[PDB]
Symmetry: D2
Subunit: 317 residues, 4 copies
C-alpha cells in the first residue's frame, strides 16, 4: 500500500494519541521543503532573466513563515539568523526547531547537491520562551531529518519509530514513502572527509585514514567520496554505509559543522538507523550546547567504522 509523508505522520500521531501539534509542524515543514525544492531546481528562473521584459534567504523565509504560522513552535534557530527567533505570542506552540534552511548553498554555483536540515525539540523550560530553549542536548530530540535536493528530492525523517525515506514526486507535489525503517550497514567501504586539511590532522585521524588506504589485514582499500555538502555526504553514508569525518583543524579548532542544526539532526538520524556519531570525545547527541551557533567536530556512520576510528582515537590517548 502506498504511503505519503503526511499520511504516515498522521497514522503515527493517532496511534500515539498525541494532540496533533507535531503533525501540524511537520506538515508545515514539508510544504516549505517543496517550495525550497522548486526554487532550488530554478522553476521560474526564466522570469529572472527577462522572458517578460537570494536562494538561502528565500529558503529561510519559507521555513520561518511556515513554522511560525503552524501555531506549533515557540523558538526558532536558523543558520541565517544571529539570534533565536521568538514566535509572537498568539502563534506560540510547544516545539523548538533548529534548522539549516539551505545547507551547502555556498557552492550552489556549481549545482552541488544541497539540503535542508532540521531538528525538533519539545520546549523544556517553563520560563518565557528564549534562546536558552534551543540549547538542549541532542538526546532530547523529538524528530529530526533532512531534505536532500540531489538528483531527486528526498526527505529523510527520523523519530522514535525509526528512520523513513520519502521521495518527492514533483508531478503531484507529494512525498512518497520509498524506504521504511532504514538501517545502516554494519560496516562500509567508503570514507568521506576533506583530505586537503591533511597537514592539520590530529594523529588519530591521520592514522585512521592510513588504515583505509593501506589496510593492515590485506583487505581492499576503501574508496573516497567527498561532495563538500554535508547532506549529500551523510545521505550517501546512510544509503551505502561507511564513514563521514569533519574533524577540527587550525581554521576550525572546535570543528566547522554546527552542533545545533547540522551535527545533532544528523547524529539523531544515524543513531536511529543503527549507526554512530561521535566527536572523538563523546557522542554528539550528549554534547550540552552553550551557544546556538557553536561548532563541533563530527565522525559518523556505520558502527564498525566509527568504532574502529574510536580504537585509533584511544590509541593516541
Amino acid at each position: 500500500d502506498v504511503n505519503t509523508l503526511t499520511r504516515f505522520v498522521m497514522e503515527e500521531g493517532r496511534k500515539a494519541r498525541g494532540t496533533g501539534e507535531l503533525t501540524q509542524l511537520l506538515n508545515s515543514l514539508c510544504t516549505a521543503v517543496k517550495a525550497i525544492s522548486s526554487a532550488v531546481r530554478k522553476a521560474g528562473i526564466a522570469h529572472l532573466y527577462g522572458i517578460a521584459g537570494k536562494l538561502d534567504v528565500l529558503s529561510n523565509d519559507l521555513v520561518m513563515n511556515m513554522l511560525k504560522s503552524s501555531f506549533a513552535t515557540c523558538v526558532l534557530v536558523s543558520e541565517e539568523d544571529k539570534h533565536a527567533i521568538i514566535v509572537e505570542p498568539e502563534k506560540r506552540g510547544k516545539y523548538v526547531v533548529c534548522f539549516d534552511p539551505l545547507d551547502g548553498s555556498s557552492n550552489i554555483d556549481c549545482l552541488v547537491s544541497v539540503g535542508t536540515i532540521f531538528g525538533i525539540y519539545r520546549k523544556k523550560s517553563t520560563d518565557e520562551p528564549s534562546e536558552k530553549d534551543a540549547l538542549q542536548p541532542g538526546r532530547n530530540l523529538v524528530a529530526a531529518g533532512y531534505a536532500l535536493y540531489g538528483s531527486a528530492t528526498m526527505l529523510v525523517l527520523a523519530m522514535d519509530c525509526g528512520v523513513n525515506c520519502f521521495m518527492l514526486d514533483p508531478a503531484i507535489g507529494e512525498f512518497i514513502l520509498v524506504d521504511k525503517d532504514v538501517k545502516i550497514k554494519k560496516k562500509g567501504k567508503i570514507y568521506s572527509l576533506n583530505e586537503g586539511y591533511a597537514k592539520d590532522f590530529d594523529p588519530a585521524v591521520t592514522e585512521y585514514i592510513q588504515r583505509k588506504k593501506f589496510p593492515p589485514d590485506n583487505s581492499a582499500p576503501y574508496g573516497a567520496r567527498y561532495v563538500g555538502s554535508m547532506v549529500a555526504d551523510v545521505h550517501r553514508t546512510l544509503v551505502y554505509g561507511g564513514i563521514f569525518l569533519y574533524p577540527a583543524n587550525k581554521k576550525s579548532p572546535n570543528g566547522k559543522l554546527r552542533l545545533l542544526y547540522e551535527c545533532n539532526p544528523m547524529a539523531y538520524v544515524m543513531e536511529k538507523a543503527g549507526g554512530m556519531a561521535t566527536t572523538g570525545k563523546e557522542a554528539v547527541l550528549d554534547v550540552i550546547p552553550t551557544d546556538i551557533h557553536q561548532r563541533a567536530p563530527v565522525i559518523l556512520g556505520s558502527p564498525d567504522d566509527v568504532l574502529e576510528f574510536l580504537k585509533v582515537y584511544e590509541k593516541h590517548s
Copy 2:
C-alpha cells in the same frame, strides 16, 4: 535580452548559413535531456509505488530515439551499446554522436548528481556508415557538452564560438542562457580524485597530490572534492577552477574513463574554456581511437594546474 538554447543555436546557425541539420540535432538532444531530467527527478514515481493500486536504459532510449528521428545522424555510439548503432537509411543525416546517456547512474541510489555527456562529429567519408566513422580524434569534434542533473538542471554546450551554459527552467521547459562564453580560471584551489586507491597510484600522482596537501612554500593547501560523478566533478572544475584526475596506473595503464563519450567531450569543453586535458603523454583530443569503447587516462582543468601535473609526471619518466 532573454535567450534560450534553441534560439541561441538557431541564431548561430543563420549567422553561419548552415543547412540546419546541427540545429535539428541539438534541438532533439535538448528534448531528450528534458525528458531525462524529469525521470531523474522522479516525476510520476508515485505510480511506481502503487498510488493507483531502468533510468540508464530509459535515458539511452530517449537519446537514441530522439537522435535517430532527428534526421541529422548516421552513427550513434553509446556507453550502453556494445556496437555502434547505424541509423536506417531514410533517417540518415551527416553527424556521428558519441554519448553517455546517464553518467554516474551506478551511484544514483544515493541521489548523487548524474549527467548526460555527448560529442558530435561530422561523418568524414562517403562510405556506408560503420563503427569506423566514430573513430575520430577529439580534435575533430563539431560540438560537445553535458547536461548536469544536479540541484538544478544545466546544459553546458561547447562549439567553435566557445562554451555557453543554459539553465533548465522546469516550469516552462526552456533552457535559459545564464552564462555566456565561460572561461575557466587560470589556476584553481581544488584537486579532485579518488584518494582511496592511493596504494595503486603512479608515483607521479602520489607526489603531485602530496604537493597539493603539503605545499613546499607558504601557500595554502588545496581543498579536496570528489563527487564520484564525472559530470559533477568536471562541472565544478569548470566553474571554480582546479584540477580533476582519473589517471593511469600500473593496474590500469589506460585509465578507467572511456575516451569517446566521457574524455573527449569533457576535454573539448575544457579547451574551449581555456583549460587543458591530457592523458599524461598527450592531449586527450589528440588520441586517435581504435575501439569505440577504449579507455583513456584524463587530467583536466585549469591550465596552470594541469601544466604543474605534467611537470611532476615528466619527473617520473
Copy 3:
C-alpha cells in the same frame, strides 16, 4: 497568514476535538486530486507518443480515488460513478465514512479539452450493521462534507463543510492547495442561465416559459446571458462564482432528470446551500430526496436564491 488544505482541515479538526479520520480521508482525497490533475494536464504524454521509442483517464481517476480512499483507513463503503455496486472496504482497512464520488465528470468531452472535474460527498455510516451498499442510501441532509475539484484553466478544490465553503487553488509548482477564497457566498441574484437549449423541443412547459422570461423579460429589462459548458463542475462553479442559475431539469422523456443524485446532485446541492444558494428538483430539495438506488437520477436546478425562486414560481404556475 497563508493557509493550505491540509493545514485548514487539521485546524478545524483540532478545534472540534475529532479523531482525525475525516482529515485522513480528505488528505487522501487531496492526493488523488493532485494525481488526477497531473494526468488531466497530460504530464508524460510524450511517452505515449514514442519519445523513448497508457490507460484511459476516467479509469485512472477512478483507480486513484478508490485506492487512496481505501488505504486511508477512514472509509467502509465507496460508491463511484464508474462502478455498478458499492465497494465494501476490506476489514483491516475499514473506517467510519461512506464516500460517493464521480472521479472525472465531464470526461466524455475531454477530447476537446473541456474543463472536467471530480465530485465527492462524504457521509457517516449510520447503522451498526456490517457495511453494505445500504449505507450509501442516505439523503444529502446527512452529508458530513462535500465538494469538487475543477480541472480548468487552473485546478481548484472547493470544499463544503458545516463551517461553510472554502476554495483552494492548486499551486502545481509545489503541489499544495492554497486557500484563496474564504467563506464563499453566492450572489442573491445573477445574470446568467445555464442549460442545454438544443433540447428545447423536449422542455417541460415550465422550463420553456422561464427561459422565455430570461430572454424576453416582461418588464423589458436587460436579458440574462447564456453559458453552457456542458461539463457540470465547470457550469456549477461559474454559477457559484458569478451567480445565476444552472438547470438540468426533468421532462416527459426523462422524468427524473439525467444527473446522478448520490455523487453529482447531492454534493453540488450541499455546496450551494452552504454558500447560501438553492438547489431544487422542482418538487423538493435535492438534499431531501431519499435515494433507493445508488445510481438513481435526479433533476437539479441550482444557483442564486432569487433566480431559483423565480424558476419555482413558473414551475408552480404550470402545476
Copy 4:
C-alpha cells in the same frame, strides 16, 4: 515517429528552403505560450498568498517580449494595445503578428478555459513599418493558430501545409504533435452562440437557430454548447464539428469579435481544416480591414452547417 512543434516547423522550413525567420518567430511564440500556460495554471500562486511572508497584462508582456527579441517581426498588434507596436530597428524582421494574448480572461475568475490567438503576416512594402502593415485581409495570412489553456494545454498551428495539433507535455515543457493534418467534420451536431441575446437576433439567425432545435426533416436536434471563451468554443467546433456563431445584429452591425486577432486566425484555421468562416455577407478572410481593432461578425465551422446558415441568410435577402 514522435514529433515536436519546433522539430515539425524546422522540417517544413528546410523542405521549403526558407530563411528560418518564420521558424524563429514560431519558436519564440511557443516559448511565450508555455510561460502563459504556466501562469494560467497558477504556478507560483503560493508566493502571492504569503508562503514566504494582471494575468492578461503579463500574457501580453510575454508575447510582446518574445516576439520583439525573435528578430523576426516588425509590427505587433495586440488586443491589449490601442496602437500597433513598432519593433525597434535592430530587432526588426519581416513579419507582422496580430494576437490576443489571453482571450476569455474577463471570465478567468471562474477558471473558464482561456487562450491565446495569433495570426502572422508578411510585412507589406519595404518602406518604414507602420500600422498600415497590419491592415491586410486574412487571405494574406502566412500562419495562424491558437493555444488553448483548457483541461490540458494545446497549440493549434495552421499553415499552407494544413492544421496540426500539439499537446503541451508539462513534465518536459515540449509540444507533442498528436493530431496531424486535421480536417473538420463535413457536418456536425452542435451549435454555439449566446442565446440570451435572442431579442436582438437578425431574423436569419433566429430562423437558423429554430431549425437546430425543431428540425423540419424530423432529424435529431443539435445540442447546444457555449463556453463564452472563443478559443474554447472554436476548438470544440474543430474537434467535434458543428457551428459557432457570433453574428451581427441591429445593436452591433459589425459584430463584437475583433477581425485582426480573433476572427481572421480562426477563419484561417477553419479554412485550412476544410471548414468555412463567413460574416454572412462574405468570407471573413476577404474583409479588408481599415482599423486594427475593428469588429467583424463571424459564423464558422463545419461546411454543411455554414452553407445551411448562408442559405437561410440569403432567404432574408
